[PDB]
C-alpha cells in the first residue's frame, strides 16, 4: 500500500551493516554464506560486492557505489552513511503533509551550495614540497591499518610517486609494480630505480656483474619452430640421431655469434637453454635465464625502449635493448636478478618483505591505492582537512544560509546540514566515548574566529589540531562523495509507484 515507505526502510538496513565500519578501529560482523568459506575484511566494498540482497531497490545504492570505488579508492563508506540520514530525516517531513517534490529540491540546492564553500575551506600547498608531502604519506598508511610500521615506509612512497611525475603532472599507476616476497621482517624494505625479476641464472659459471647491459629482448615461447611453409622433421636411424643433436646445437652457436657481434654483452633469452648451450654463453660471459613469464618481457620493451622481435634469425645492432647495471645479489634468501637503468629510467618497483604470505599481501593491497589518493592530490594542489572536522563547520555555514531562503523548502536545508553531524558521532562511539557530551564541545571551538582545522583525536580522545596529529584528506573524496549522495537518493524519493517488471530482455 505505502510502497514508498518500504524503500526508505530498506536503505537503512543496507547502511546499518556498514555504519560501524567507519574509522580506523572499525569492527565488522560475520556474514558467511551457506557454503562455509569464512571471509573477514574491513573494507565495505568487499562485502557489498559479494553480499546478497532481497529487495530490487537495494541495487540503486550499490550501483552508484561501484562507480565511486573506481575514482578515488577510499571514502566509499562515508558516502553510504550520509545517505541513510538524508533518507531517514525525510520521514519527519512526510508526516507534516510534505510532498516529496519539496524535499528533493533542498538537497540539490544545498549540495550545489557546498561546492563553493569547500573551495574556501581548502588550503593551498605546493606540488614538490617534500616537507608537507611526508605528512600526507603517514596519514594514508595509518588510515588503512598498519601503525606499527610507518616511519621508513612513508619515505618509500613519497620518493616513488615523486620520481614518476611527468612534465604535465599526471600519475600513472602502471609504472608502480608490487613484488611480494617473505623475508626476515617488514623493516627490510627498499625501492629500486628500475625493474625487478624473480629469476636466477641457469649456470653458476656466468658473470655476476656487468656495466652497460645490452639486453636482447625476445618475444617467443619454447617450442619446436617451423618455417611458414609446411614441413616436418623425420628420423629413423638411431645411430644418425647423434648427428642431428649436434647439428642443431651448431646452428645456435653461430646464431648467437651474430647477436654478440652486434654488441650484446648480456642476453635474456625466453627458451629452454640446452644443456650444452649453457657452456657457450657462460665462457663468453653472457648471462641468461630459462622460461620467463610474458608479463616481465612486456615492461622491458617500453622501459628500455627496445623493439619487439619475433624472428631470432634477424637480430642486428638495431634490434636490441639497453639497461644500466645487471648485478646478481640476494636479499635474505634466494638470489634473483636486479636489472636497473639509472641513465633513463621510467618505472619503479617495491619488494615489500615480511614473515608470512598473508601479512605481505594485506599491506601490498592497501599501498596500491594509497599512492592513487596522494597522486591525484599533487595534480590538483588543493587540500582540505577532514575526519569530521570540516563536517562540523559546514553545518554552521548552511544554517546561516537557510535563514535567507524563504518558502516551505526551508525545512529540508536544515535536515541536510544536520545530517552530516553523524560523522563525529560514529567516531566518538567507536572509541567507547559518549557522543551527546562530546558534540557540544567541538562546536565551541568553531564559535566564530576559531581554527577551522580541529577535530576529535581517536587516540587521546579529545579535541586537538588535525594539522599537528594527522587527519587530512583531499577534497576530491568529499566533493564527489557528497555529489553522488544527492544523485543516488533522488532515485527512491521521486518514484512513487511500483511496476510488475517481467520479461524485459
Amino acid at each position: 500500500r505505502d510502497a514508498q515507505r518500504m524503500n526508505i526502510l530498506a536503505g537503512r538496513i543496507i547502511a546499518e551493516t556498514v555504519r560501524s565500519t567507519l574509522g580506523p578501529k572499525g569492527m565488522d560482523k560475520m556474514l558467511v554464506d551457506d557454503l562455509g568459506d569464512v571471509v573477514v575484511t574491513n573494507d565495505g566494498v568487499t562485502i557489498l560486492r559479494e553480499m546478497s540482497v532481497e529487495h530490487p531497490a537495494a541495487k540503486m545504492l550499490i550501483e552508484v557505489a561501484k562507480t565511486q570505488e573506481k575514482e578515488v579508492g577510499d571514502g566509499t563508506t562515508t558516502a553510504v552513511v550520509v545517505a541513510g540520514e538524508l533518507l531517514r530525516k525525510a520521514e519527519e517531513l512526510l508526516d507534516q503533509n510534505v510532498h516529496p517534490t519539496i524535499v528533493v529540491k533542498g538537497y540539490q540546492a544545498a549540495a550545489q551550495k557546498a561546492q563553493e564553500l569547500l573551495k574556501t575551506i581548502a588550503c593551498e600547498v605546493g606540488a614538490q614540497d617534500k616537507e608537507i608531502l611526508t605528512k600526507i604519506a603517514m596519514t594514508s598508511i595509518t588510515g588503512k591499518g598498519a601503525e606499527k610500521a610507518k616511519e621508513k615506509l612513508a619515505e618509500i612512497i613519497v620518493e616513488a610517486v615523486s620520481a614518476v611525475v611527468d612534465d604535465e603532472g599526471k600519475v600513472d599507476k602502471d609504472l608502480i609494480k608490487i613484488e611480494k616476497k617473505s623475508g626476515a621482517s617488514i623493516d627490510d624494505t627498499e625501492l629500486i630505480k628500475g625493474v625487478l625479476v624473480d629469476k636466477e641464472r641457469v649456470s653458476a659459471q656466468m658473470p655476476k656483474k656487468v656495466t652497460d647491459a645490452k639486453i636482447a629482448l625476445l618475444n617467443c615461447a619454447i617450442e619446436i619452430k617451423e618455417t611458414e611453409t609446411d614441413a616436418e622433421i623425420r628420423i629413423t636411424d638411431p645411430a644418425k640421431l647423434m648427428e642431428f643433436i649436434e647439428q642443431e646445437e651448431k646452428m645456435l652457436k653461430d646464431m648467437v655469434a651474430e647477436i654478440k657481434a652486434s654488441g650484446a654483452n648480456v642476453l635474456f633469452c625466453q627458451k629452454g637453454i640446452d644443456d650444452l648451450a649453457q657452456h657457450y654463453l657462460a665462457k663468453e660471459g653472457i648471462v641468461a635465464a630459462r622460461r620467463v613469464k610474458k608479463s616481465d618481457m612486456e615492461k622491458l620493451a617500453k622501459a628500455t625502449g627496445a623493439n619487439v622481435i619475433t624472428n631470432i634469425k634477424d637480430l642486428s645492432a638495431q634490434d636490441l635493448g639497453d639497461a644500466g647495471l645487471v648485478e646478481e645479489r640476494k636479499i635474505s634468501g634466494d638470489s634473483m636478478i636486479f636489472v636497473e637503468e639509472c641513465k633513463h629510467p621510467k618505472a619503479v618497483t617495491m619488494l615489500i618483505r615480511g614473515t608470512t604470505e598473508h601479512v605481505i599481501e594485506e599491506v601490498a593491497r592497501a599501498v596500491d591505492d594509497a599512492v592513487g589518493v596522494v597522486g591525484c592530490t599533487i595534480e590538483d594542489g588543493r587540500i582540505v582537512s577532514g575526519g569530521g572536522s570540516t563536517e562540523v563547520e559546514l553545518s554552521m555555514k548552511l544554517r546561516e544560509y537557510a535563514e535567507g531562503i524563504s518558502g516551505r523548502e526551508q525545512l529540508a536545508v536544515r535536515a541536510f546540514a544536520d545530517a552530516l553531524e553523524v560523522i563525529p558521532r560514529t567516531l566518538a562511539e567507536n572509541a567507547g566515548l559518549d557522543a551527546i557530551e562530546i558534540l557540544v564541545k567541538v562546536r565551541a571551538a568553531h564559535a566564530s574566529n576559531g581554527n577551522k582545522c580541529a577535530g576529535l583525536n581517536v587516540f587521546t580522545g579529545a579535541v586537538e589540531d588535525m594539522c599537528e596529529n594527522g587527519v587530512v584528506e583531499p577534497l576530491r573524496v568529499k566533493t564527489q562523495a557528497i555529489q553522488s549522495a544527492a544523485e543516488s537518493t533522488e532515485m527512491l524519493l521521486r518514484i512513487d509507484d511500483v511496476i510488475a517488471a517481467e520479461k524485459l530482455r
Side-chain angles (χ1 to χ4, degrees):
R1 185 267 182 275
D2 300 329
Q4 63 88 359
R5 291 292 186 84
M6 183 175 62
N7 300 20
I8 61 179
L9 301 177
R12 299 179 60 180
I13 303 301
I14 185 62
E16 189 279 343
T17 59
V18 298
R19 184 176 61 85
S20 180
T21 61
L22 182 61
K25 302 179 181 179
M27 300 182 297
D28 300 70
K29 301 296 183 299
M30 306 299 85
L31 181 61
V32 185
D33 60 356
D34 62 330
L35 179 59
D37 298 333
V38 183
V39 180
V40 176
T41 58
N42 182 22
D43 192 331
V45 175
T46 303
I47 301 174
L48 301 176
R49 184 177 181 180
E50 184 176 1
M51 183 176 62
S52 300
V53 297
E54 54 181 359
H55 295 289
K59 299 180 180 180
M60 305 301 89
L61 288 67
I62 302 175
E63 183 64 12
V64 299
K66 298 175 66 176
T67 303
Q68 184 64 9
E69 184 64 12
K70 61 176 66 176
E71 298 181 0
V72 187
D74 186 4
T76 58
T77 59
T78 305
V80 176
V81 67
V82 294
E85 301 297 347
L86 301 177
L87 184 62
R88 183 178 62 85
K89 297 293 184 180
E91 183 178 0
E92 300 295 350
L93 301 177
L94 299 176
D95 180 70
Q96 300 180 0
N97 301 330
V98 179
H99 198 261
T101 301
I102 301 174
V103 58
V104 297
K105 183 176 179 61
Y107 302 154
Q108 299 180 0
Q112 183 178 0
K113 181 61 177 180
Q115 300 295 351
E116 300 180 0
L117 302 177
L118 297 173
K119 298 180 179 61
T120 60
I121 300 174
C123 302
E124 299 295 350
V125 297
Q128 299 181 0
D129 298 69
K130 300 296 183 62
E131 299 181 0
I132 186 61
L133 182 61
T134 55
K135 301 296 183 180
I136 301 173
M138 64 180 184
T139 302
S140 300
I141 187 175
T142 54
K144 304 295 180 60
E147 292 71 358
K148 62 185 294 184
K150 60 180 182 299
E151 299 181 0
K152 186 178 69 175
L153 285 65
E155 185 63 13
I156 299 173
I157 300 174
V158 299
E159 295 179 0
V161 302
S162 61
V164 297
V165 182
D166 56 1
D167 58 72
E168 60 179 0
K170 297 293 182 180
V171 176
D172 185 3
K173 61 181 180 180
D174 181 70
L175 303 177
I176 304 178
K177 282 66 174 180
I178 305 177
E179 291 69 2
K180 299 183 294 184
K181 180 62 176 61
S182 300
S185 60
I186 301 173
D187 191 10
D188 301 330
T189 304
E190 184 63 12
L191 46 63
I192 301 295
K193 302 296 182 62
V195 299
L196 181 61
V197 56
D198 57 330
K199 298 295 295 185
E200 184 177 359
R201 61 188 184 280
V202 302
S203 60
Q205 300 295 351
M206 295 178 176
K208 186 180 292 184
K209 182 174 65 58
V210 60
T211 305
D212 300 330
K214 302 296 295 186
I215 301 174
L217 186 154
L218 181 62
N219 182 90
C220 297
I222 173 55
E223 181 62 15
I224 184 62
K225 304 299 181 182
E226 181 179 356
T227 308
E228 64 282 355
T229 304
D230 60 330
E232 302 298 350
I233 306 301
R234 182 178 180 84
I235 56 179
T236 179
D237 191 331
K240 191 174 182 62
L241 181 61
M242 184 176 295
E243 301 294 348
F244 302 152
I245 185 62
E246 63 182 2
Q247 180 62 299
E248 298 180 0
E249 293 172 350
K250 183 178 181 299
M251 298 177 63
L252 301 177
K253 183 178 179 61
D254 58 357
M255 183 180 296
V256 175
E258 300 180 0
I259 302 174
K260 182 179 179 61
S262 301
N265 56 17
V266 291
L267 201 175
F268 196 89
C269 189
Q270 189 175 1
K271 288 186 174 62
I273 302 176
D274 183 68
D275 58 358
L276 183 63
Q278 301 181 1
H279 181 274
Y280 302 154
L281 286 298
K283 299 294 182 298
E284 298 179 0
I286 306 179
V287 301
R290 62 180 186 273
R291 298 180 178 84
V292 291
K293 299 186 295 184
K294 178 57 177 178
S295 60
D296 300 330
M297 301 300 297
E298 184 177 1
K299 63 181 183 180
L300 300 176
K302 61 181 180 180
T304 60
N307 300 330
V308 180
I309 305 300
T310 59
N311 180 20
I312 61 178
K313 300 180 181 299
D314 180 70
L315 298 173
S316 62
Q318 300 180 0
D319 300 72
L320 45 67
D322 181 69
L325 301 177
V326 184
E327 182 177 0
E328 183 65 11
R329 61 180 63 85
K330 57 176 64 57
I331 50 175
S332 64
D334 299 70
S335 60
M336 301 62 63
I337 301 174
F338 297 83
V339 182
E340 300 180 0
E341 182 180 1
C342 59
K343 280 63 175 180
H344 186 189
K346 298 182 181 299
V348 291
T349 60
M350 299 182 297
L351 35 62
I352 184 62
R353 310 300 298 276
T355 58
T356 309
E357 299 181 0
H358 180 269
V359 293
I360 62 178
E361 61 180 0
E362 183 178 1
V363 302
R365 184 175 180 84
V367 62
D368 60 71
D369 59 356
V371 300
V373 183
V374 183
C376 63
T377 302
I378 303 300
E379 300 180 2
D380 183 69
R382 307 183 65 178
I383 305 177
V384 63
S385 59
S389 300
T390 59
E391 286 69 4
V392 180
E393 183 64 12
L394 298 175
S395 60
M396 182 175 62
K397 301 298 296 185
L398 298 175
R399 292 178 180 180
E400 298 180 0
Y401 180 85
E403 183 177 1
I405 185 63
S406 61
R408 299 179 61 181
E409 62 179 359
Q410 64 183 0
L411 293 75
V413 292
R414 298 181 61 84
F416 181 86
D418 299 329
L420 302 177
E421 300 178 359
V422 293
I423 300 300
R425 182 179 299 179
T426 57
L427 302 178
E429 183 177 0
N430 191 331
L433 302 177
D434 181 72
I436 59 177
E437 294 293 351
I438 297 293
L439 296 174
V440 293
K441 299 185 294 184
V442 64
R443 299 178 180 179
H446 302 272
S448 60
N449 62 330
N451 60 331
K452 61 182 180 61
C453 300
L456 180 61
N457 182 19
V458 58
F459 298 92
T460 59
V463 301
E464 299 183 0
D465 300 330
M466 305 299 85
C467 300
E468 300 180 0
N469 297 270
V471 183
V472 182
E473 299 296 349
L475 52 70
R476 183 176 298 276
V477 59
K478 303 297 183 180
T479 58
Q480 186 65 9
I482 299 173
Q483 180 56 217
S484 60
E487 184 176 1
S488 61
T489 58
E490 61 181 0
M491 299 180 180
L492 302 177
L493 301 177
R494 296 176 62 269
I495 186 64
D496 299 327
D497 55 356
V498 299
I499 55 179
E502 58 84 10
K503 182 61 177 179
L504 190 63
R505 181 59 55 84

